[PDB]
Amino acid sequence: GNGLLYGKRGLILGLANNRSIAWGIAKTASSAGAELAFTYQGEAMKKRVEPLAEEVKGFVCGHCDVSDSASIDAVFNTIEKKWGKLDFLVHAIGFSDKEELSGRYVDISESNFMMTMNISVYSLTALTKRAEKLMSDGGSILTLTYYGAEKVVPNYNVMGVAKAALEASVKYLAVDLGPKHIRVNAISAGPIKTLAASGIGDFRYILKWNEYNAPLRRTVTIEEVGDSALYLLSDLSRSVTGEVHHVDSGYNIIGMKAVDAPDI
Amino acid sequence: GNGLLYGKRGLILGLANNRSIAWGIAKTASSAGAELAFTYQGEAMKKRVEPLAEEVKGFVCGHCDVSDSASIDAVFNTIEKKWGKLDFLVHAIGFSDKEELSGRYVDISESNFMMTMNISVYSLTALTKRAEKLMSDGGSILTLTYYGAEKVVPNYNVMGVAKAALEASVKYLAVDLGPKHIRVNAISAGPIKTLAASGIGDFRYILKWNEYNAPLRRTVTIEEVGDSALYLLSDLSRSVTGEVHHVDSGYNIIGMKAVD
Amino acid sequence: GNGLLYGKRGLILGLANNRSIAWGIAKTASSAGAELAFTYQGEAMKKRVEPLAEEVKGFVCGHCDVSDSASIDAVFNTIEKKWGKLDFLVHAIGFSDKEELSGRYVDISESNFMMTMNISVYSLTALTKRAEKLMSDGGSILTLTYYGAEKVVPNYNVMGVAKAALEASVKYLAVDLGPKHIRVNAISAGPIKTLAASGIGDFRYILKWNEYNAPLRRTVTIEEVGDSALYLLSDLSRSVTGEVHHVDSGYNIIGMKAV
Amino acid sequence: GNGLLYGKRGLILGLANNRSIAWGIAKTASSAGAELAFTYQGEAMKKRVEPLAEEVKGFVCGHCDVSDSASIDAVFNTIEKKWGKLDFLVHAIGFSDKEELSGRYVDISESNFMMTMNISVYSLTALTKRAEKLMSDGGSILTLTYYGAEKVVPNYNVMGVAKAALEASVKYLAVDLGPKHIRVNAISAGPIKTLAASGIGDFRYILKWNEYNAPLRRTVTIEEVGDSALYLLSDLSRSVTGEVHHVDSGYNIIGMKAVDAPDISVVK
Ligand SMILES: NC(=O)c1ccc[n+]([C@@H]2O[C@H](COP(=O)([O-])OP(=O)(O)OC[C@H]3O[C@@H](n4cnc5c(N)ncnc54)[C@H](O)[C@@H]3O)[C@@H](O)[C@H]2O)c1
Ligand SMILES: NC(=O)c1ccc[n+]([C@@H]2O[C@H](COP(=O)([O-])OP(=O)(O)OC[C@H]3O[C@@H](n4cnc5c(N)ncnc54)[C@H](O)[C@@H]3O)[C@@H](O)[C@H]2O)c1
Numbered sequence A: 001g002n003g004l005l006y007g008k009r010g011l012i013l014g015l016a017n018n019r020s021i022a023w024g025i026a027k028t029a030s031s032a033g034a035e036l037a038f039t040y041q042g043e044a045m046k047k048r049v050e051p052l053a054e055e056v057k058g059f060v061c062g063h064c065d066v067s068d069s070a071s072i073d074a075v076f077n078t079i080e081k082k083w084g085k086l087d088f089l090v091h092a093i094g095f096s097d098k099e100e101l102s103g104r105y106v107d108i109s110e111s112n113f114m115m116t117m118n119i120s121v122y123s124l125t126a127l128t129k130r131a132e133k134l135m136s137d138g139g140s141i142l143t144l145t146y147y148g149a150e151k152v153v154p155n156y157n158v159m160g161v162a163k164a165a166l167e168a169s170v171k172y173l174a175v176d177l178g179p180k181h182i183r184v185n186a187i188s189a190g191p192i193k194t195l196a197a198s199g200i201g202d203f204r205y206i207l208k209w210n211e212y213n214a215p216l217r218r219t220v221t222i223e224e225v226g227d228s229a230l231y232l233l234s235d236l237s238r239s240v241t242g243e244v245h246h247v248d249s250g251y252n253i254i255g256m257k258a259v260d261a262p263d264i
Numbered sequence B: 001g002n003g004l005l006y007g008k009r010g011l012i013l014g015l016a017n018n019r020s021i022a023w024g025i026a027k028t029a030s031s032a033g034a035e036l037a038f039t040y041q042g043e044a045m046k047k048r049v050e051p052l053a054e055e056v057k058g059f060v061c062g063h064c065d066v067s068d069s070a071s072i073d074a075v076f077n078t079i080e081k082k083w084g085k086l087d088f089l090v091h092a093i094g095f096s097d098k099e100e101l102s103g104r105y106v107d108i109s110e111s112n113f114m115m116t117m118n119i120s121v122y123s124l125t126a127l128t129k130r131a132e133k134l135m136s137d138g139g140s141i142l143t144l145t146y147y148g149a150e151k152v153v154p155n156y157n158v159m160g161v162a163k164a165a166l167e168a169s170v171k172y173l174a175v176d177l178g179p180k181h182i183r184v185n186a187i188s189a190g191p192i193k194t195l196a197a198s199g200i201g202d203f204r205y206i207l208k209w210n211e212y213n214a215p216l217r218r219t220v221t222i223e224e225v226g227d228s229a230l231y232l233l234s235d236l237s238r239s240v241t242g243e244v245h246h247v248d249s250g251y252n253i254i255g256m257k258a259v260d
Numbered sequence C: 001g002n003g004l005l006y007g008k009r010g011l012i013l014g015l016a017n018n019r020s021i022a023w024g025i026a027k028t029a030s031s032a033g034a035e036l037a038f039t040y041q042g043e044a045m046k047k048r049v050e051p052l053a054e055e056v057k058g059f060v061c062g063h064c065d066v067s068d069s070a071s072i073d074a075v076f077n078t079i080e081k082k083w084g085k086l087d088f089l090v091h092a093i094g095f096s097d098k099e100e101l102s103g104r105y106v107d108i109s110e111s112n113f114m115m116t117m118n119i120s121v122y123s124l125t126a127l128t129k130r131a132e133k134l135m136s137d138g139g140s141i142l143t144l145t146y147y148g149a150e151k152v153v154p155n156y157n158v159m160g161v162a163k164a165a166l167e168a169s170v171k172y173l174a175v176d177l178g179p180k181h182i183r184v185n186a187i188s189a190g191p192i193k194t195l196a197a198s199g200i201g202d203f204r205y206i207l208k209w210n211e212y213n214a215p216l217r218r219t220v221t222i223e224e225v226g227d228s229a230l231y232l233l234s235d236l237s238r239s240v241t242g243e244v245h246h247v248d249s250g251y252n253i254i255g256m257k258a259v
Numbered sequence D: 001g002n003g004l005l006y007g008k009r010g011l012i013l014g015l016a017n018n019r020s021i022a023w024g025i026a027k028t029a030s031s032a033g034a035e036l037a038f039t040y041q042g043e044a045m046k047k048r049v050e051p052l053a054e055e056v057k058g059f060v061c062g063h064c065d066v067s068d069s070a071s072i073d074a075v076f077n078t079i080e081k082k083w084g085k086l087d088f089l090v091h092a093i094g095f096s097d098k099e100e101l102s103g104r105y106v107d108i109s110e111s112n113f114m115m116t117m118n119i120s121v122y123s124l125t126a127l128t129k130r131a132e133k134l135m136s137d138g139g140s141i142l143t144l145t146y147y148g149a150e151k152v153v154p155n156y157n158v159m160g161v162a163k164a165a166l167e168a169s170v171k172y173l174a175v176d177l178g179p180k181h182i183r184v185n186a187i188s189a190g191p192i193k194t195l196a197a198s199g200i201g202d203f204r205y206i207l208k209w210n211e212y213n214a215p216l217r218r219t220v221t222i223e224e225v226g227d228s229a230l231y232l233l234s235d236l237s238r239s240v241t242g243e244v245h246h247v248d249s250g251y252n253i254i255g256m257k258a259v260d261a262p263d264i265s266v267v268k
């Protein structure tokens, strides 16, 4: 191991299965030395999270639905009693109504708008606020975003609006926690075939488009994103805060399909 | 007049008093020949909107609170019956808790976050759903935003997060409706002394900082924002959509305190 | 007309023929009341600029090649003698080796890099140096840029690097001259079939890609860019400076193929 | 050792002294296992580079002035004979007339504009041209930029125009070389007291301003930039290209001084 998180203790929310971006981050951080606490969303997720948590010599700290303030408080109560401190926090939580991830953005329902904003955006602020006084000087908070916050990606619709709000909240949070040297950053990941991302209409097309048009000519993996997360969670990135870090084979820099790019 | 909106018909939501940005927009648009309709938020706002509408020979189409879906349906039904089609729409509505626009972003309540996102962001999508039906022949939709959507500005907090979502929704809406040639744009205005803008704490300092450090060495007025709105509402800008247009004396371009 | 430039006088550099973006700017500005002066780049351009200037009752103030500082001085002397003051200036000048607007950016030549940077970027600062003396009462300076400054557009290559420097210089000039109320802005135009743009490798493809995928589902014209330029040159935009303004049917906002 | 650059060979251009950003990058890359080669710009620089190179078990591969294309090809000939392949390249080179890093950008001279663009921008493209054949199995190319490319920083002037071109060239190069898995990125560094940066007018004001107004309430060090560079030069960042990575204590995210942040008074 590289020892980059030796003796560090961190909390990961959003582990769903062994395809989760959160699982890539967990494997990498654990190999780097971190002891990891995991939450789970509802009893079903629990049976899948438990053997994964055992595999990284971490542990399951409890149920957390981020719309449930009491479940947030309980999780951080557990951490406080068990560790008395928290070195880093990974926010890998996102939700939007899969039915409305298609057609036109203008046709979304209000309930989908409110639910998407609350689960995908406010939850990072709620978690950071509850975590602030537990967090060590020099700590690191990490969330995940997508290029659809910057440019219009079809079928991503209200989630793009939500991710633009998430990236802005990262900057405001970074200013709030900066004097405590707690950094707040986001990885803008390229598309990866996960449970939640499968709900996007025509996701197969989006993957191939990235494979054909991204500079590196391939899509990224949870292990690659995990290594980039390790950098932002470790002291290697101690002067980096408020940053949207693209881990996407360079896709975000292209302004047009290559004329000789193959047709999908 | 310059005739840039001659014969055009537009709906303005968000006129509150004679210092509103919406009032600068209304005055310029009327002088350019537009027929204007106005909503009002509640009975106390109605008392101020009626004489201002009279001054520009516009008309008041009724009460609209954007948290009340039925009232949105009602004012758009009124406009549809009177005019049939709409040429432009101005969305000058924003709201956030005044007491939390001071102190730390991280300290905001969930209720304030959700209310701000709904009134300041969702409302544009809610209104555009209805307006699209009246703009089959094309049109222009305009909202208002602020540099705190791009960079951290003191005391703007959750409104900065909300305006970042608003600017993104402008681009998603512009993609939705572009094939119908309905354009959707935003003006990123500099700070101006209005009623809503007075709630932001330390506002006097924000104004002076812009006055002393913006390239043009002065803050902007509702009449200047009105003239930029006129461009975006008129056919002059017929190839512009999804744009966030800074009308801020250039403040958004500086990276540090000006030299003098 | 709309009168937006009534009583105003401006200088336009970069008119090549009746397809130039500068020609759309000229026609619109003339219809809005502006008195216009034009330069030309050499004898071949002169044969078209002179009668075109006549069609908008404009003034031909002479030859200007922005690589030739003496010729810049002479046109501004000519302007100063005739007018005294200048209300606005249009910089519609760009150049690169068309043979290298293809293949890989990394294969460009050093001489092409330097020539492109000089003609396409430094020229705006050089022209602004002289316009400043004539713009004591304020004014508006406009240049033209392209989305290839922000994101990679294939075959645009060193012109993309150049336009990124241009957009930055617009902002630094805006800080310099803003206290004198001289505004400096750029229009980021969508692709248009002009003499200069036609040398871009696979330019037809870039046009069609924009036609099929821009929000408005069409490319833009010199008359549409001219109307946006009118706004930025007129007092309607008197609180706008340092701005990069997209006139491109919304193309710059998309992140993937349209559906 | 963390071993993140175990067995890797890299070339570093731009080491001037023990305060250079390139020195921080070199110390970190060497600690992580890298075998390093250094150029020097002239004889006065050579006197400082040779002992610094020895300190990191590095090796000096000769004189390079990027306005002299013969010297570029010479050092890449030396590298190709000693090593054959190259894993990473560090471009820590910038220049502009320090007498004009003050007053108004509109008053710059044409020769200063052209010389700044050539040394500070085209040099990255020229170096990458040669490095391409030595990086046939992939690699990582890193340059340094500054937030004055994005927003106006007074007295940075033509250097900000140049850094905007440099950042664009990073993206175009990343597209060119991506298919060969050669990544091209930039670190946007916050201000650091170095030889070159000291030429900026009132650079101490820019430093104090960053200390009070950056989110982390401090300016950055060459060791911190070195650690961020380690990430971009190593396989940990193998899916990252075309990136402008801010290592600036977060300064770039600020849109206005806080109301209660200090108003700096100055004395002569
Ligand atoms: N997969 C991609 O292509 C991609 C690309 C860019 C960004 N991202 C982001 O990565 C993050 C992780 O998603 P993923 O792709 O790994 O998918 P995933 O399905 O593995 O993870 C999403 C997680 O969100 C959790 N979640 C949803 N609503 C919740 C709630 N109310 N309370 C608590 N937890 C809740 C789920 O339990 C799940 O663990 C998301 O923020 C997503 O937007 C993903
Ligand atoms: N004033 C500035 O300095 C400034 C700067 C940048 C952007 N803006 C934006 O300009 C817009 C107009 O603000 P202003 O400065 O003219 O202030 P204002 O006080 O004159 O107008 C705000 C309007 O919002 C309306 N509104 C609020 N909640 C509503 C609801 N639930 N339903 C219906 N209407 C509702 C009010 O009725 C009022 O007319 C806002 O979106 C604001 O964010 C203002």
Ligand SMILES: NC(=O)c1ccc[n+]([C@@H]2O[C@H](COP(=O)([O-])OP(=O)(O)OC[C@H]3O[C@@H](n4cnc5c(N)ncnc54)[C@H](O)[C@@H]3O)[C@@H](O)[C@H]2O)c1
Pocket (backbone or CB within 6 Å): C013, C014, C015, C016, C017, C019, C020, C021, C022, C040, C041, C045, C064, C065, C066, C067, C091, C092, C093, C094, C095, C119, C144, C145, C146, C188, C189, C190, C191, C192, C193, C194, C195, C196, C197
């Ligand atoms: N046409 C497009 O698609 C497009 C898109 C974005 C931006 N632009 C920009 O618009 C501007 C005008 O170009 P256009 O498309 O109208 O083409 P054009 O061929 O009509 O005009 C280009 C002009 O540049 C002039 N020029 C070149 N080198 C010169 C020199 N050394 N000295 C003086 N003048 C010189 C030519 O004489 C000509 O008048 C350029 O800056 C171009 O990059 C064009």
Ligand SMILES: NC(=O)c1ccc[n+]([C@@H]2O[C@H](COP(=O)([O-])OP(=O)(O)OC[C@H]3O[C@@H](n4cnc5c(N)ncnc54)[C@H](O)[C@@H]3O)[C@@H](O)[C@H]2O)c1
Pocket (backbone or CB within 6 Å): D013, D014, D015, D016, D017, D019, D020, D021, D022, D040, D041, D045, D064, D065, D066, D067, D091, D092, D093, D094, D095, D119, D144, D145, D146, D188, D189, D190, D191, D192, D193, D194, D195, D196, D197
């Ligand atoms: N120091 C800062 O505050 C700061 C901030 C942001 C970015 N940067 C960038 O970091 C890089 C390194 O600068 P530094 O601060 O370490 O300063 P430095 O003085 O330590 O290094 C600058 C180097 O550029 C080299 N150089 C200049 N002209 C050259 C030429 N013609 N040929 C070859 N080499 C040449 C010098 O020999 C020197 O080694 C530069 O690109 C600079 O713009 C510095």
